[PDB]
């Protein structure tokens, strides 16, 4: 398939089947970095992402679009012929849906013994009858993993937003597939990967849950965006708006207490010499620290706080709104936001390729493809004749460019 | 270094320098999957994660601990000797701190031309004077990327929790390093990677921001954990507690409207045949949909809703609290939560290895190492004599087991 040679993953061949965020995010990250990535959509209906007015121009860029019925007769045979030249296949389904329909890992490996197979599901490839075959999106994974219950304000839990669990799961899939690919080079045999979304989010939520699993108590939710345990950490108000700060480190704590009028607290049983963190609940002075911190901050503008905190090596930042991003000097300097052309010939704006590879930078070479756009090209490249593909379209088993 | 042979990354050698979550998360994910991973801590002070009572038993398991002054005299030489046998080096610093201290990418490559170098920072390896050298933690990256402003309730923004941006950044580092490693096999030359935390989070926050960058408006924050745009999506109340649901799909919408008493709305200008999603703001019936949905749900128990939604292929789940996780049948069946022994000989409980590799499963083989534990072993393995290492300890340039 015609495309430029770029990035660390040039020459790698990736195929994915899945809709919305998680599966396709995993697949498309390969394309950001140079790989040849085929997006499989069903024949009768298209990916549900196409209902979003602008996002798909970013989340589906650099992709080739195949539209094929991968489970039915000649569609199935065509799909399995494609697998012979495929290095990595990402699939997102309700549990072991592929195996249930006859496309097992053993069947796939009969066509390509080196193939890396990544199964993404809500609840895993096996477990109980009750959960294994259930559909899942982001919020389902947050609910089932204890992540949702940790987010929100004290009295009101809420999901992390937007679609946080989908990105973590997709990213985990990408990472695991690349790890397995490394093993194929060193062993010459394929791998199968079982990524359950709830297990991904369970790991991302352990910072305080590890206390519960090991004798302790679970932490509360944040109060108005302040860390539930550590004073001087999270969201604060200055005289002219919101900032964030992290009061961490021996020196930072000593100079900040001095600033806020609390120098006498240094060297007490719960804040002894060398204290790197002040625990707002274990220390009797916790609420007092917050009271004086709040009052000192309300006396200063964001700019003044930034300068003093720059002097103390205290991490902080103004909370930026979306309209403030484009013209930020750091964004401009690094080209964090760029422009590209859509397939239809319109100018689209959005984030550039991330991260920055020094020797082999990624690039945007293609806008989001249309439904069935590359079908005729992909099938011809795997041995199908013009009339033979015409029969796949007529039988309802494949769709070509509109 | 003595360790079992397991996982897709057996025989890979990884070194990381960084503290807390992001850097070490990237490094330790290699160790979950079989790699030999060296954790570098400073000599005079240890990783700040050690202040957490339980989490480090999970986040630092499977690791070898080196304690060395990588920038000073014989410590520097020892570090650069280690790099000769290292495949991947992860470093987390304030901007280009390594280069500023004399350890440039060109210097590193003089010792190992195939080395993959991953630089993790808040604001990148280059940019403006104002931002590039600033310290960063999770909340700083959320603030600077527009992620924080999207999380929380309508009237109250708040960070995603816990330390969400740290895990995304660490995971991106792992993925990029593995992608670059693939290129080294196919080109025989090293790579340098510039991962700025704010650019990572900028990408994770695009779902609705793409509308703003392309003519449209930015969405509001969620109201009590309901999707800002799409009805039937997010957090709801049943008669006996919180659930989450995603009302997505042609069939799901038709049968659910029928259930809630809104069948007559189907086939109207804004809900025409084939509608996969109901937009709560573009549709005049949006608030009515929510009103009837809320009332129908309040009539039913969680269990009843689950059964009916299982009949309709509508994704949903009870919102689980932390105490409900251990004894959940899916968690038990898959061993999602397991037990292991610490270095001190105590039983520790927490998440198992994720994800599940079929042919080469990861395993927990070592608990979290002590400060300086493997120093003498690592230095001896790179050509240092017992007396020569004794001088590194005495000069304050290295620390050995306590
Ligand atoms: C997202 C999800 C709920 C959607 O599933 P769905 O409601 O059944 O909708 P789909 O369009 O994917 O599936 C319809 C059917 O077509 C099949 N199908 C999918 N792609 C096909 C193709 N290219 N050709 C022929 N059939 C196809 C599916 O297998 C499914 O049949 P099944 O019930 O036997 O498994 C589900 O795929 C899932 O839980 N995935 C795992 C988690 C995930 O990825 N979530 C999305 C994160 S945003
Ligand atoms: C986390 C962070 C704020 C801490 O930085 P810090 O306050 O300077 O604390 P450190 O202990 O890391 O650094 C102290 C000094 O020791 C140096 N140092 C670090 N490891 C060393 C080692 N093994 N031997 C000798 N010196 C070392 C550092 O370079 C630094 O000196 P510098 O100012 O010239 O750069 C910073 O590393 C950072 O912004 N990292 C990038 C983003 C990130 O990883 N955040 C953490 C996510 S939880």
Swiss-Prot record, chains A, B:
Residue runs in coiled coils: none
Cellular compartment(s): Cytoplasm
GO CC, alphabetical: cytoplasm
EC number: 2.8.3.21
Inducing factors: By L-carnitine or crotonobetaine.
Keywords recorded for this protein, A-Z: Cytoplasm, Transferase
Top enzyme category: transferase
Note: Some strains of E.coli, such as ATCC 25922, can metabolize carnitine under aerobiosis.
Function: Catalyzes the reversible transfer of the CoA moiety from gamma-butyrobetainyl-CoA to L-carnitine to generate L-carnitinyl-CoA and gamma-butyrobetaine. Is also able to catalyze the reversible transfer of the CoA moiety from gamma-butyrobetainyl-CoA or L-carnitinyl-CoA to crotonobetaine to generate crotonobetainyl-CoA.
UniProt record similarity statement: Belongs to the CoA-transferase III family. CaiB subfamily.
Descriptive protein name: L-carnitine CoA-transferase
Species this protein is from: Escherichia coli (strain K12)
């Amino acid at each position: 398939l015609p495309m430029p040679k770029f990035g660390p993953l040039a020459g790698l061949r990736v195929v994915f089947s899945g809709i919305e965020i998680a599966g396709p995010f995993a697949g498309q990250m390969f394309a950001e970095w140079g790989a040849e990535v085929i997006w499989i959509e069903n024949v009768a209906w298209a990916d549900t992402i196409r209902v979003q007015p602008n996002y798909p121009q970013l989340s589906r860029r650099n992709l080739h679009a195949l539209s094929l019925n991968i489970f039915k007769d000649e569609g199935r045979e065509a799909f399995l012929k494609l697998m012979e030249t495929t290095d990595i296949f990402i699939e997102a389904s309700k549990g072991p849906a592929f195996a249930r329909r006859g496309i097992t890992d053993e069947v796939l490996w009969q066509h390509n013994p080196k193939l890396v197979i990544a199964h993404l599901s809500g609840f895993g490839q096996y477990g109980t009858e009750e959960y294994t075959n259930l559909p899942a999106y982001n919020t389902i994974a947050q609910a089932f993993s204890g992540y949702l219950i940790q987010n929100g304000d004290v009295d009101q839990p809420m999901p992390a937003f937007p679609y946080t669990a989908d990105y973590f799961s997709g990213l985990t899939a990408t990472t695991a597939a690349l790890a397995a690919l490394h093993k194929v080079r060193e062993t010459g045999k394929g791998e199968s990967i079982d990524i359950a979304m709830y297990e991904v989010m369970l790991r991302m939520g352990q910072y305080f849950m590890m206390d519960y699993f090991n004798g302790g108590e679970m932490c509360p939710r944040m109060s108005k965006g302040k860390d539930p345990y550590y004073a001087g950490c999270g969201l604060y108000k200055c005289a002219d708006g919101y900032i964030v700060m992290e009061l961490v480190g021996i020196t930072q704590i000593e100079e900040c207490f001095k600033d806020i009028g609390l120098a006498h607290l240094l060297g007490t049983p719960e804040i002894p010499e060398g204290t790197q963190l002040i625990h707002r609940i274990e220390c009797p002075y916790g609420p007092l620290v917050e009271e004086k911190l709040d009052a000192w901050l309300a006396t200063h503008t964001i700019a003044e706080v930034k300068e003093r905190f720059a002097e103390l090596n205290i991490a902080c930042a103004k909370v930026l709104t979306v309209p403030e991003l484009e013209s930020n000097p750091q964004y401009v300097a690094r080209e964090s936001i760029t422009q590209w052309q859509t397939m239809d010939g319109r100018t689209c704006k959005g984030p550039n390729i991330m991260p920055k590879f020094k020797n082999n930078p990624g690039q945007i070479w293609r806008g989001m493809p249309s439904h069935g756009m590359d079908t005729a090209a992909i099938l011809k490249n795997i041995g199908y004749s013009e009339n033979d593909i015409q029969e796949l379209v007529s039988k309802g088993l494949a769709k070509v460019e509109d």
